[PDB]
Amino acid sequence: GSREVAAMPAARRLAKELGIDLSKVKGTGPGGVITVEDVKRYAEETAKATAPAPAPKAVEKA
């Protein structure tokens, strides 16, 4: 709807999914619009893993 600033289509999606406020994201797109990079960046910086510490890399153990 009629929100503030400008956001990217994919960005707004991740905002609705992750519950991110694009109105507070750093706009770095068309004219100064928040892009998915900004959303994914802010969302991860605001709340990416506030509980799960163990984060493996190689897939060997089951």
Give me the residue spans of the domains in the chain: 2-45
Quickly tell me which residue has 């892009």 as its tokens.
35
Could you please state the CATH topology (level 3) that the domain comprising 2-45 is classified under.
Answer: Dihydrolipoamide Transferase (4.10.320)
Q: Residue 34 phi/psi, 5° resolution?
A: -70, 130
b/e per residue, 15-44, with b = 16+ CB within 10 A? beeeebebeebebebeeebbbbebbbbbbe
DSSP 51: S
Helices then strands, counting H and E runs in the chain, come out as: 2, 0
